Design a protein around this ligand. Structure first.
Ligand SMILES: NC(=O)c1ccc[n+]([C@@H]2O[C@H](COP(=O)([O-])OP(=O)(O)OC[C@H]3O[C@@H](n4cnc5c(N)ncnc54)[C@H](O)[C@@H]3O)[C@@H](O)[C@H]2O)c1
Ligand SMILES: NC(=O)c1ccc[n+]([C@@H]2O[C@H](COP(=O)([O-])OP(=O)(O)OC[C@H]3O[C@@H](n4cnc5c(N)ncnc54)[C@H](O)[C@@H]3O)[C@@H](O)[C@H]2O)c1
Ligand SMILES: NC(=O)c1ccc[n+]([C@@H]2O[C@H](COP(=O)([O-])OP(=O)(O)OC[C@H]3O[C@@H](n4cnc5c(N)ncnc54)[C@H](O)[C@@H]3O)[C@@H](O)[C@H]2O)c1
Ligand SMILES: Nc1nc2c(ncn2[C@@H]2O[C@H](COP(=O)(O)OP(=O)(O)OP(=O)(O)O)[C@@H](O)[C@H]2O)c(=O)[nH]1
Ligand SMILES: Nc1nc2c(ncn2[C@@H]2O[C@H](COP(=O)(O)OP(=O)(O)OP(=O)(O)O)[C@@H](O)[C@H]2O)c(=O)[nH]1
Ligand SMILES: Nc1nc2c(ncn2[C@@H]2O[C@H](COP(=O)(O)OP(=O)(O)OP(=O)(O)O)[C@@H](O)[C@H]2O)c(=O)[nH]1
Ligand SMILES: Nc1nc2c(ncn2[C@@H]2O[C@H](COP(=O)(O)OP(=O)(O)OP(=O)(O)O)[C@@H](O)[C@H]2O)c(=O)[nH]1
Ligand SMILES: Nc1nc2c(ncn2[C@@H]2O[C@H](COP(=O)(O)OP(=O)(O)OP(=O)(O)O)[C@@H](O)[C@H]2O)c(=O)[nH]1
Ligand SMILES: Nc1nc2c(ncn2[C@@H]2O[C@H](COP(=O)(O)OP(=O)(O)OP(=O)(O)O)[C@@H](O)[C@H]2O)c(=O)[nH]1
Ligand SMILES: Nc1ncnc2c1ncn2[C@@H]1O[C@H](COP(=O)(O)OP(=O)(O)OP(=O)(O)O)[C@@H](O)[C@H]1O
Ligand SMILES: Nc1ncnc2c1ncn2[C@@H]1O[C@H](COP(=O)(O)OP(=O)(O)OP(=O)(O)O)[C@@H](O)[C@H]1O
Ligand SMILES: Nc1ncnc2c1ncn2[C@@H]1O[C@H](COP(=O)(O)OP(=O)(O)OP(=O)(O)O)[C@@H](O)[C@H]1O
Ligand SMILES: O=c1[nH]cnc2c1ncn2[C@@H]1O[C@H](COP(=O)(O)O)[C@@H](O)[C@H]1O
Ligand SMILES: O=c1[nH]cnc2c1ncn2[C@@H]1O[C@H](COP(=O)(O)O)[C@@H](O)[C@H]1O
Ligand SMILES: O=c1[nH]cnc2c1ncn2[C@@H]1O[C@H](COP(=O)(O)O)[C@@H](O)[C@H]1O
Lengths: 519, 519, 519
């Protein structure tokens, strides 16, 4: 479980110089009751959003850096950070999904594209970091230096083993890399690869049947960039690459599978066409699926959940969008591994004033997460996240992970180009029901634009530090402890009037210019 | 000289199927006279700035890519691009001066710092790209792997040759790079370098007395990252690095000296302390000096020019902001190698409303350049450059090179950090007389801010393409040809009314959003 | 006469190592001709104001601090600084007129008050600093301590010699100062002054007929605060105070008469009642008069000039507001000692759009000053002064002194109270024809308000440094040299288009925040 502020304070006193007290209660020391429990905050029957309340501070006995951010994404997937990139076309193709998985989150690739385009973007994510490279790019020695330059420009790899037949079943005859084609003149599409390859007699190679770690130490001490792995009959089984040891060293939080590939999610719809799409995504090695709709409690979605679970039984599935326990029930009972929570919140959205449907997002996260914990199901809080305070609030109210759109939009890894809208660098960010990119055909999104924020690799550690410092002022050692304090009634809340929201902001200053983080 | 639009058109006709005409004039064909000559434009005796006139289009017989942008900076320095970074604290330290020299321009490092700080920033520029590295980092084999990690942390160089003294006056015992320290655990500051160095029996080395091209080919075919150069007694004379062959390939315009180091300029003032400062800068290998002032026609500046030309007679000197021929005369006669032109123009200025002094910048560039060409002296047009049209206008009016402040400010290579003030990503940009960074002490600058523009290496090729397309539309094959057409009276101009400046902008559109450049 | 930039440069060359040239011209060296002469700038026959032109920079061979700002106010009055405070009720009563005279300018007290109020404000200016105090506060010994406190609260003078009769026509019996009444409790209005005065046997005194300097040395070595001056029969002739030696040390520019009193001016109108008002002002010891009217070329003003000159022939008179040489003629011919120049310029003014009359102020200063110098008459440039650049321009065009309203308004010495208008400290500033203060009775001014600027004693040295630095970039060693360069054609001007005025200011910065001066 977790240890109370009174228990922690009592323990820190017992570690220093400064009786019948244990017999009166014991462990349950006196704390004066102040603020509201989450049960009491939401018993009000009013629509509260992240701006309408505050979390009261606790007792601190740890540094903010010791705060554990480990989170369940689904019944079976754990991420080292609570952060998810939202499956939108102006947010997340492979560049974003790689950057999020490296920083210890995940991305879900968007589906405003062909099945083959989406499966190729998933395949680009899964190939970025590797244990054994088991389907390497291979060439026959009868190819040309111009074919190595073409391969480098088509895939992006220079380290190409050369086997007789030209596949990973033939016999190894050499390797080509950058430093044996890099200096070559315009005689590229004439010089045969046998003229440039480092020949198989020169190679450091390892016998096939070595663990990844044994092979890593062999590669590591060889001082080479590639190590070929070869069976008894001297045939190319796999390669490994020293840049993947560097990627490991460079990114200590990265979300990886057992093959040391980055985790990737993808979106699909609930149409009959989405089954073929799902077949290609599972061939591409996708780790988790979001089903993707305004209103997830439907016969169409409940059918698609049952199909995915009958066909790919090891695959993880997240339920659509829900905002009530009555919606969450039918999807949990259909057998989803997580739920996405939010309807009409989201910076680009107009669904509440178009459809009349939605819910205030603080209430929705609390009500759906409180229902879902009864079955062990994780919640994603989706949309309305404008600040690190909204992330800490979403997590404190019972969300396991937080999904962001506009906060990750106009980073360098978000799709498209900047275009300098109106005296500001200012990138495009749209919404998936925008009618800008998809019978009267009603819009539910608004095609806006967002200020430049630079790289995800510089912006996500600012989110992580803000979440850890928020947990420290609360007195929570981890996100699991934070949610345990909330369901126990130890975590206390205060409501805000309008003037309380105003005094929480910046007041009657003339000029105002905050710098977010400095490194 | 150059060939005229009539001559070019007549030659293009002679190349195709489509008499006594040559005898009437010959070569000088009829063109109807339209617009003004530059001498007529400025004979008006009104203060014209870059917005108050236009250049009329010519005859096109070449592609916008064939346009030669080569420019004289001084009597003896030529740059492959007309572009200079202004010596200001919020614009140009070594990161900017490296980026500008790589893209074929130059930077002048600012002097709002100590003599040792400025000479160290010059030394960082000169060390970034190298022919023979003659003063490499060297260690003795009695040093420890923790010293190599410290040398990487302090200097930035992974590849350290090892000699028995630990200096380049000694026999080479081997080499240490990253791939023989990169995997090491916390036993770094105990393990000796003799346990990790690739010994001199394993090395590829070349005999001292090779040319740089011979040494390049030896290094290149060796496939190693370093080649040590050694004398007859096996002592380390120099090293070369394949990193510099890559830098060369990657940056085809880069402004370099005979030692293959980047060119760097620096600023100094006209005080007695600037004599010592100049000595450190010349020890650091500075290529050119700006004497830096609001008003360069002074006894103090004319003394400093004579001092520099007596003490360092091979150093290049630029005269320090003149706007009249009468000012330019005394500095040209004192023996400067170029002039900086502009006074109280420049985005951060208040000099004209504080001092009453200045001149309108189109007029000043024309008057000073037309006087300076009589003596063969190049002009830098400085300040007021808001657009690529202002660059093309400055160059057409007789400037050899253009110096920019605010246009290069708030790039990634400009000094300082971004601070997200008011829904805009901004960087700090001030002016050198701004009283925010330096007797009543009057201000001449204003401490503003500028919006983010990303990297110089992405923004300067936009300037280059805009300058070449501007030349193509004019009908000029090079910037020398453009200035030759101007002094000959072939290049034609039109004055603009206020309404003409309005119709040259964007009109009564409701929304408006231009993408500057795409690829 | 002045010495030319060519002559100065040639002299600086003769001071260092760096023939027939003197014979070709001699002293008149070659300078390339650039810009316009003032004669040529105004020959254009368009209305130029201070914003429509610039002064071209010269040759510098002195530091900006060597610049002499000495100026003629009238035919017979000289001030150590060109600066005058404008006779308006929101600008100049005695506090402002003292502060301006101390910083080496002058103030003219306003006449929107009673004759006795104006003469009392003049008397407050004249009493602030003193040589011999010839009419001191004197009390008789039959008086109380309560009388000494009432005198201190009615005049402000704590040091009171005690003579028998209680007037200067009597024997001295002691002195009372603050230090021998300050500790007394509230039993004040009982105790006789003979109980508290330092008696005449204890006093250091000097014999009548000592010069002011001899008396200064006696007071100085005595270490006392006062020195009484006494005749041979031991009667009180005068006192002097060490406070005035401190004031003298503290204000080295202060505008003083031969009795070491500050200079003061006053306004009067041209009604019959102004004849009585003038008699009180001359009894108060006023130094100079303004005749204060929108249009000074009137039969009423020419009558009042002849009256003042026939009655008070030693008094200095400034003719009213003129903008043409044809107006200036009839007032110079009536016998004025200076002229005020400007009509409809002035920040609070509406005369041009109400009356159709006025003139552009650059043209008016030039045309009136060029006419007035033929007779040796000084010009005051009045109104439209927004910057130190406008002061330098007005002086360069031929004004001897500059008179300011809105620039001195909302200082601490300007009349009235601050009242914090709209989130800014913001004081009132009205105009004298404003109908806010005073048959349809037409308004000619606009009852506005101005930002706080602190003390005149902190703001006028900023003006002085700005004027001196402006003269230095022009190459003028004094204001007389600046006007000599202008009438000779050595001083050169450039006109400004609209875009030229725009590039002289601050450009497309996002934020902008200049600090005027730092001390
Ligand atoms: N969460 C929100 O607040 C919200 C609101 C609007 C849109 N969106 C987003 O925009 C996108 C579009 O959402 P959507 O709800 O319009 O997509 P959707 O395809 O789920 O629903 C659109 C319509 O198609 C119907 N439909 C779906 N599957 C069907 C099937 N098999 N047979 C017949 N009809 C079927 C639905 O009932 C609905 O009427 C998604 O990316 C979604 O996440 C989100
Ligand atoms: N070009 C412009 O329009 C412009 C205008 C204002 C300021 N600036 C910039 O701001 C900075 C400061 O310019 P500045 O003109 O104030 O610097 P500066 O050092 O040239 O001049 C400052 C003052 O010191 C004096 N001075 C200079 N050397 C002297 C010496 N040896 N002995 C005595 N006095 C001496 C000058 O005459 C001047 O009064 C520079 O970076 C300059 O480029 C540029
Ligand atoms: N300088 C300016 O541009 C300007 C413009 C308007 C007002 N003011 C100021 O307003 C204040 C009021 O003065 P004013 O400008 O109204 O002019 P004013 O008070 O001198 O005269 C007002 C009117 O009365 C007339 N008048 C003056 N003396 C007269 C006499 N003896 N007999 C008969 N008629 C006589 C004038 O001709 C005019 O019509 C002054 O402080 C003046 O300087 C200044
Ligand atoms: N060479 C190679 N690398 C692959 C392949 N599939 C994935 N990769 C990844 O691509 C990277 C290797 O790129 P290379 O071009 O071979 O050369 P490198 O020096 O190892 O990597 P860089 O430093 O990025 O150039 C590693 O991160 C591999 O995991 C493949 O078929 N061949
Ligand atoms: N070749 C290769 N080896 C890896 C990779 N990631 C981990 N390993 C190896 O497996 C070991 C696993 O230990 P860690 O590095 O602590 O755990 P990790 O989660 O796999 O990797 P990190 O992302 O660095 O935490 C490493 O020491 C490496 O030897 C990878 O991408 N490629
Ligand atoms: N080691 C080394 N060799 C260089 C460097 N720059 C040029 N060289 C070599 O010197 C020769 C110069 O030819 P270029 O490269 O065509 O001309 P460059 O002006 O020196 O370099 P570019 O900037 O590429 O034009 C070639 O053999 C280059 O490989 C450098 O930084 N380091
Ligand atoms: N090794 C080394 N490089 C130097 C030195 N002075 C300048 N350099 C430059 O530093 C750069 C990188 O040096 P290294 O770290 O040794 O070589 P590198 O491994 O190719 O550099 P990266 O690939 O960028 O890590 C080259 O461009 C050299 O020209 C020096 O003393 N030693
Ligand atoms: N008591 C007295 N003596 C003064 C005063 N002003 C000047 N003096 C004296 O008269 C002599 C004048 O010398 P300065 O003070 O250098 O010249 P100044 O022109 O009178 O005054 P400044 O312009 O203020 O320097 C000195 O002996 C002064 O001490 C004053 O207000 N009171
Ligand atoms: N005492 C006195 N000072 C006068 C008189 N008329 C003008 N003053 C001026 O007022 C100042 C002297 O004021 P005091 O009240 O005597 O006191 P103080 O000696 O200045 O001492 P503090 O006011 O405390 O600095 C000097 O500058 C005098 O020139 C007068 O009748 N008596
Ligand atoms: N396992 C190996 N055994 C022997 N030689 C190898 C092996 N792997 C690569 N080589 C050779 O080593 C040299 C360097 O290749 P490596 O992969 O280490 O660097 P690279 O990626 O090509 O160089 P760089 O990083 O500078 O671009 C090449 O000549 C290559 O053919
Ligand atoms: N001239 C040389 N002769 C022989 N071996 C060398 C030579 N120069 C470097 N080495 C050795 O070759 C190996 C690779 O070094 P190299 O400089 O080529 O790559 P690196 O820059 O260290 O590799 P990386 O780019 O991956 O960081 C190291 O073990 C190094 O000690
Ligand atoms: N000429 C003089 N000879 C002798 N005593 C004097 C003379 N002038 C003043 N005194 C006496 O000297 C003492 C100090 O006088 P002073 O004028 O310096 O006092 P003050 O101005 O009130 O002092 P403070 O500046 O501290 O307030 C008083 O007791 C005063 O009566
Ligand atoms: O067009 C749309 N209409 C309605 N909701 C949308 C639309 N597109 C995406 N969303 C939701 O908006 C969320 C992102 O919200 P944001 O982080 O506040 O910008 C997504 O994850 C979706 O749940
Ligand atoms: O404080 C200052 N006042 C006036 N001119 C300055 C100041 N600092 C720099 N400058 C000039 O401003 C130029 C840059 O102008 P910009 O490119 O328009 O932003 C510089 O190269 C200098 O000549
Ligand atoms: O009410 C008014 N109407 C017209 N002109 C005025 C009025 N009051 C003062 N002035 C003029 O305005 C000048 C001050 O102008 P300023 O310095 O620009 O504010 C004064 O010296 C007068 O000449």
């Amino acid at each position: 479980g977790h240890e109370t502020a009174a228990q922690r304070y009592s323990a820190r006193l017992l570690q220093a110089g400064y009786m019948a007290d244990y017999l009166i209660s014991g462990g349950t020391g006196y704390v004066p009751e102040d603020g509201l429990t989450a049960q009491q905050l939401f018993a009000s029957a009013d629509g509260l959003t992240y701006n309408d309340f505050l979390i009261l501070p606790g007792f601190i006995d740890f540094i903010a850096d010791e705060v554990d951010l480990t989170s369940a994404l689904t019944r079976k997937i754990t991420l080292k950070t609570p952060l998810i990139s939202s499956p939108m076309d102006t947010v997340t193709e492979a560049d974003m999904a790689i950057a999020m998985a490296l920083m210890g989150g995940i991305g879900f690739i968007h589906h405003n594209c062909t099945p083959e385009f989406q499966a190729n973007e998933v395949r680009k994510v899964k190939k970025f970091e590797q244990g054994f490279i088991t389907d390497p790019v291979v060439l026959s020695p009868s190819h040309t230096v111009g074919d190595v330059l073409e391969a480098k420009m088509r895939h992006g790899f220079s380290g190409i083993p050369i086997t007789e037949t030209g596949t990973m079943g033939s016999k190894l005859v050499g390797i080509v890399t950058s430093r044996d084609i890099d200096f070559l003149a315009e005689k590229d599409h004439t010089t045969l690869l046998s003229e440039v390859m480092t020949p198989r007699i020169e190679l450091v190679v390892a016998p096939a049947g070595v663990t990844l770690k044994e092979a890593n130490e062999i590669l590591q001490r060889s001082k080479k960039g590639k190590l070929p792995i070869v069976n008894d009959c001297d045939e190319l089984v796999a390669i490994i690459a020293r840049t993947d040891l560097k990627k490991n060293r460079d990114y200590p939080l990265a979300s990886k599978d057992s093959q040391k590939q980055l985790l990737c999610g993808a979106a699909v719809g609930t149409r009959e066409d989405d089954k073929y799409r799902l077949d290609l995504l599972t061939q591409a090695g996708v780790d988790v699926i979001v089903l993707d709709s305004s209103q997830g409690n439907s016969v169409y979605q409940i059918a698609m959940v049952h199909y995915i679970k009958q066909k790919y039984p090891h695959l993880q599935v997240i339920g659509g969008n829900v905002v009530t326990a009555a919606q969450a029930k039918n999807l949990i009972d259909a057998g989803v591994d997580g739920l996405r929570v939010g309807m009409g919140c989201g910076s680009i959205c107009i669904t509440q004033e178009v459809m009349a449907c939605g819910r205030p997002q603080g209430t929705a996260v609390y009500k759906v997460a409180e229902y879902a914990r009864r079955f062990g199901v994780p919640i994603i809080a989706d949309g309305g996240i404008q600040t690190v305070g909204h992330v800490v609030k979403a997590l404190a109210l019972g969300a396991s992970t937080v999904m962001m759109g506009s906060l990750l939009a106009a980073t360098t890894e978000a799709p498209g180009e900047y275009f300098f809208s109106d005296g500001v660098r200012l990138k495009k960010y749209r919404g998936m029901g925008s009618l800008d990119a998809m019978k009267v055909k009603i819009a539910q999104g608004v095609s806006g634009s967002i200020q430049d924020k630079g790289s995800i690799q510089k912006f996500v550690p600012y989110l992580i530090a803000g979440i850890q410092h928020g947990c420290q002022d609360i007195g929570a050692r981890s996100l699991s402890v934070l949610r345990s304090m909330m369901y126990s009634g130890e975590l206390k809340f205060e409501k805000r009037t309008m003037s309380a929201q105003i005094e929480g902001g910046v007041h009657g200053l003339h000029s105002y210019t905050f710098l977010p983080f400095t490194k």
